């Protein structure tokens, strides 16, 4: 569940930085936010 | 549509089962040159970070694309010759290499002629590195085909451009496509009625 | 503080007060306090502060009797603010409001000067629907009759015809910018930096009027003639026209090579056929009207 939340929050970070592709930085920030 | 899809998936390409990223970017650059207009080409290919990095890796196709973009002529033609050779070698592009080269030559001629009311065949030949007679015959062939918006005065060699309204092109395309679809509809009608 | 100089600190002292909120204070004293605020703000040369303070006065208050000095001071401060800003339409409105003051209404010379300022500033205002309506009302004003020349100037600026700035200056200049000792000449164009600016603006308004008239009457014109009629050289005339075109006040395509200007937008088939169909509709309506007239005359002259 936390892994899925990390994926979703990486998508949300890619959204916040208006952009079409989720990136390594988005995944990093998603992990940091979720944990 | 090939260029549209390739530009969509340029930054997310992972299908190595088909071909390497180098070849993928090569194909993307080719289709983008032959399909996209100057603004879209500038925004997508000439400035896309991934395309620029892979073109830094590629010594030749980068030169081809940028020569086309920034109007360095006759280098566009050596590039077009080499790319034509590899297109003919390639199985995917093979039964379209002649068409692609013809379209790219037409695009280069149109790009050179767009921003000038007249342009001497001598200047055209000097820009393209080719001879005056060859460029004259090529230009006349394309004008007869109807894919260039100019005429050429031969008694005193000079290419004079014109601006036909897009309504004429749209009418010609409408007549052509409607003729194809009307032939199909009539064929269906004969098939059904009897 | 002000009597001791140091006007900025006195200003600050005043705007520390939110006099608009004090309920017990009478309305007249509240307005006087706000006017003092505005006066010291103007002295400090804080026009933004003066404007926002001015926004705290309800002009309706200058109608319930005894409000003569208050309204005159308010509108004079508004005129000063708008002059320091650059507007002319608001100055015209404020001068007209002053003209509407009984105190100015009496003492004939006062309303002479007030109406002169109103006319001058409505002329100076750039053209638009609001300015056109204002000049319409000012011309409709009856008391213009007393002043001989300013009514004529308003007539010239409201007439749909050209007017050369040379003859404008010759006929009117000597009795607007100076002169008229018998009837004091307003200070709208006085020999001071701001008066020079206003005179240049009047020249610009004259040129704009000429260009508008030429735009509406001409299908096509040459620069060598447009400049001649605008009393400018070819370069200044074409620069003015380019400024107007860029601002989108007037449409005009300038073929510099042939020295031509055309004010007609490119012909659209939709527009052409719409004009043709409107002509046809008007024709049908006119034949209906004329046959009704036929019936009327036949009724009158047929029975007997």
């Amino acid at each position: 569940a936390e892994v899925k939340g990390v994926c979703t929050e990486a998508g949300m970070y890619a959204l916040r930085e208006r952009r079409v592709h989720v990136t390594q930085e988005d995944f990093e920030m998603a992990v940091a936010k979720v944990m | 549509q090939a260029a549209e899809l390739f530009l969509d998936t340029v930054s997310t390409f992972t299908s190595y089962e088909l071909m390497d990223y180098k070849t993928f970017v090569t194909y993307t650059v080719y289709v983008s040159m032959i399909a996209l207009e100057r603004p879209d080409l500038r925004e997508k290919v000439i400035k896309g970070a991934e395309i620029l990095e892979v073109l830094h890796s590629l010594p030749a196709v980068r030169q081809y694309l940028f020569s086309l973009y920034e109007c360095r002529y006759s280098v566009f033609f050596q590039s077009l010759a080499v790319v034509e050779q590899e297109m003919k070698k390639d199985w995917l592009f093979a039964p379209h290499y002649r068409y692609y080269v013809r379209e790219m030559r037409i695009h280069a001629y149109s790009q050179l002629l767009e921003s000038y009311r007249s342009l001497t065949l001598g200047y055209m030949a000097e820009a393209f590195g080719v001879g005056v007679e060859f460029i004259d015959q090529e230009l006349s062939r394309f004008i007869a085909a109807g894919r260039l918006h100019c005429k050429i005065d031969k008694v005193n060699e000079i290419v004079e451009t014109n601006r036909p309204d897009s309504k004429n092109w749209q009418y010609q395309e409408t007549i052509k496509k409607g003729d194809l679809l009307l032939n199909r509809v009539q064929k269906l009608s004969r098939v059904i009625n009897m | 503080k002000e009597q001791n100089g140091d006007v900025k600190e006195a200003a600050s002292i005043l705007q520390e007060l939110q006099v608009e909120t004090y309920g017990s204070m009478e309305k007249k004293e509240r307005v006087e306090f706000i006017l003092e605020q505005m006066r010291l703000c103007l002295a400090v040369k804080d026009y933004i502060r003066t404007q926002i303070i001015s926004k705290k006065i309800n002009t309706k208050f200058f109608q319930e009797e005894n409000t003569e000095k208050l309204k005159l001071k308010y509108y004079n401060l508004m005129i000063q603010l708008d002059q320091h800003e650059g507007s002319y339409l608001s100055i015209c409105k404020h001068y007209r409001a002053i003209y509407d003051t009984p105190c100015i209404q009496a003492e004939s010379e006062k309303w002479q000067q007030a109406l002169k300022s109103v006319v001058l500033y409505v002329i100076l205002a750039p053209f638009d629907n609001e300015q056109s309506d204002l000049v319409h009302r000012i011309s409709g004003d009856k008391k213009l009759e007393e002043i001989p020349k300013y009514k004529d100037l308003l007539k010239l600026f409201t007439t749909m015809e050209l007017m050369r700035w040379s003859t404008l200056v010759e006929d009117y200049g000597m009795e607007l910018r100076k002169g008229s000792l018998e009837s004091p000449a307003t200070d709208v164009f006085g020999s001071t930096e701001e008066g020079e600016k206003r005179w240049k603006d009047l020249k610009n308004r004259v040129v704009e009027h000429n260009i508008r008239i030429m735009a509406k009457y001409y299908t096509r014109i040459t620069m060598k003639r447009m400049a001649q009629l605008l009393d400018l050289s070819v370069d200044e005339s074409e620069a003015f026209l380019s400024n107007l075109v860029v601002n989108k006040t007037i449409f005009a395509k300038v073929d510099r090579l042939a020295g031509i200007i055309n004010f007609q937008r490119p012909k659209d088939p939709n527009n052409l056929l719409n004009d043709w169909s409107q002509k046809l509709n008007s024709l049908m309506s006119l034949v209906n009207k004329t046959t009704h007239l036929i019936a009327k005359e036949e009724m009158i002259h047929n029975l007997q």
Partner: protein, 159 residues
């Protein structure tokens, strides 16, 4: 602030850089440092680079930006006015006025080239708008540039 620098130092997106600078300005708004002035400077630079110079005046006139009037924000005000006027001469005048402020490499000297290019294009558009057929020499005389350079730029714009 560092993210807003790195974005628009790598170019690409300017709206995200403007958002980063706005957040940095809110953070630096005298709450914890005096760098709010430079954050606002970068914010105005992003707003003008976005081809939206009309917003700079409101951005500087905002209640919170009102208390930052100075040689650092008025310079960007002048640059925004030049961009609105599409007047390369006025842009050069603003640079000459605020040379050190706008050219002492405060992470804007790398963008003055783009400013010059886009403003030159806009000024050419403005000068050619009231014309159906004009001399290139006349355009050069109006925009203060060489005939060959304006010819090349006009050809590029046409293409």
């Amino acid at each position: 602030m560092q993210s807003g620098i790195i974005h628009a130092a790598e170019e690409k997106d300017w709206k995200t850089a403007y958002s980063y600078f706005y957040e940095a300005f809110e953070g630096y708004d005298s709450i914890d440092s005096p760098k709010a002035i430079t954050s606002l400077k970068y914010m105005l630079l992003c707003k003008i680079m976005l081809n939206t110079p009309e917003d700079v005046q409101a951005l500087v006139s905002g209640k919170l930006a009102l208390r930052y009037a100075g040689r650092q924000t008025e310079a960007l005000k002048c640059v925004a006015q030049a961009s609105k006027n599409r007047s390369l001469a006025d842009f050069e005048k603003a640079l000459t006025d605020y040379r050190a402020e706008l050219r002492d490499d405060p992470i804007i000297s790398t963008h003055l080239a783009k400013l010059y290019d886009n403003l030159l294009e806009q000024n050419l558009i403005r000068v050619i708008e009231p014309f159906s057929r004009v001399q290139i020499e006349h355009i050069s005389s109006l925009i203060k540039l060489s005939k060959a350079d304006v010819e090349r730029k006009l050809s590029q714009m046409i293409l």
